[PDB]
């Protein structure tokens, strides 16, 4: 049922690799190829769990997907194509397939059930939910708009403006896929930038969706419904989530020297990378270059000594999965390192605020949870941290909780467990080879 892992104090981590496919577009290319006009061709996609049960839900909708060669290869329905599933769609532990897909399809005239596992099966699809209420979706869900949730379409749907109540990228996802059967314009209007996969990738697939970002930041965008998408060609960049524990492998292993190639630099995806900078940290960004229509470049890692900083609350949307990897840099670091605007943590795969802030005070580090923040001390040295009982930090089904414990036992003078390191193959099948291939030693127990 659960496979622990335990990593060990390593010599430096030396090489040059190339990241998996990035995630959030790896999904939306399964999704918007699967909805398209014709055919679409991917390379580089991630073949993590959470990606594969969003092709999965789509094959079931009516798209054909298959793999030639190293090229994903979609022969899509085309907007409005959609068939009506016969069984409920799994998402596994993938919250953002679950929720874009509540979107795509809880506007059309049939019914879908959504289900997952027992991490999914705890976090809250109101966010989402909400929004489909007022188009039209009659919805029927556990207490709390918990999974399994059934949803039924109108005839036709309502266009709506809608104002993102937290700075989530999948509310803003979800209510845009479910303008796309929707006539009439549909509006979200986020007051704070999130990952921007939804808005890039539709205009590239021909969709009339605009953005207009007034010098406040805030961001006001167009979704004309009903319109003709058309099968692209998408090279999916690196994953720069995935690409943080190597990275921070790297900068915290004495004597290391890691080059991750082709990985993606969209500035609402760079935000660790900026802290970690800021703390001291030497990465070098290499042949920065457009590739499938997104910035990506080259970095280059070596250890350095960091200093603690403070992470304010308005960075938090451009790295909110990189929280748990931050918080293991930080207990290396000199003095204190301080982070708000965290309550978005508490509803992830995990409530990583408290799985991180365990997890540390298991492995000896002084920090302290607030209810939406954390501060840690470090410890440069890595003295006296980990664990020599052997105590196994518990994951709670998080594959980012697993990772960034893994790297810190690699720094650490006493080894980690973690208590299950089956998760990782949501989002990273390849960690563990890419991580040894590195030099660091990770056993599976
Ligand atoms: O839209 C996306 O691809 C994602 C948005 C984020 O979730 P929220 O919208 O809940 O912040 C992120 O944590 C998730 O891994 C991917
Ligand atoms: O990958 C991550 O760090 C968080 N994913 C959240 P989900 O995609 O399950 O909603």
Known sequence: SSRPATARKSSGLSGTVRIPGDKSISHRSFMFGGLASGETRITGLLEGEDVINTGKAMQAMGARIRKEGDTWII?????????????????????????????????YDFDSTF?????????????????????????????????????????????????????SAQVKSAVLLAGLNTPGITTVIEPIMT??????????????????????????????????????????????????????????????????????????????????????????????????????????????TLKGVTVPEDRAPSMIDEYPILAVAAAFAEGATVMNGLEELRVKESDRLSAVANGLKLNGVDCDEGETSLVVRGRPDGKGLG??????????????????????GLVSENPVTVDDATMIATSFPEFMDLMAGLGAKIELS
């Open 115 to 167: 289900i997952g596992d027992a991490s999914l099966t705890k976090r809250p699809m109101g966010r989402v939910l909400n929004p489909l209420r007022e188009m039209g979706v009659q919805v029927k869900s556990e207490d709390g708009d918990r999974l399994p949730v059934t949803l039924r379409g109108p005839k036709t749907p309502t266009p709506i403006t809608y104002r993102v109540p937290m700075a």
């Open 75 to 107: 022969d899509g329905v085309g907007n409005g194509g959609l068939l009506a599933p016969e069984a409920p769609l799994d998402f596994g532990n993938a919250g953002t397939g679950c929720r874009l897909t509540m979107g795509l399809v809880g506007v």
């Open 195 to 304: 990952r921007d996969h939804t808005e890039k990738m539709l205009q590239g697939f021909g969709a009339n969706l605009t953005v207009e970002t007034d010098a406040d930041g805030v961001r006001t965008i167009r979704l004309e419904g009903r319109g003709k998408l058309t099968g692209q060609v998408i090279d999916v960049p690196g994953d720069p989530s995935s690409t943080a524990f190597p990275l921070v492998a790297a900068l915290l292993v004495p004597g290391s020297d890691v080059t991750i190639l082709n990985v993606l630099m969209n500035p609402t995806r760079t935000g660790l990378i900026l802290t970690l900078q800021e703390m001291g940290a030497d990465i070098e960004v290499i042949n920065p270059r457009l590739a499938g229509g997104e910035d990506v470049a080259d970095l280059r890692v070596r250890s350095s």
């Open 387 to 408: 664990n020599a009982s052997g105590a196994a930090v518990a994951t709670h089904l998080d594959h980012r909780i697993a990772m960034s414990f893994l790297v810190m």
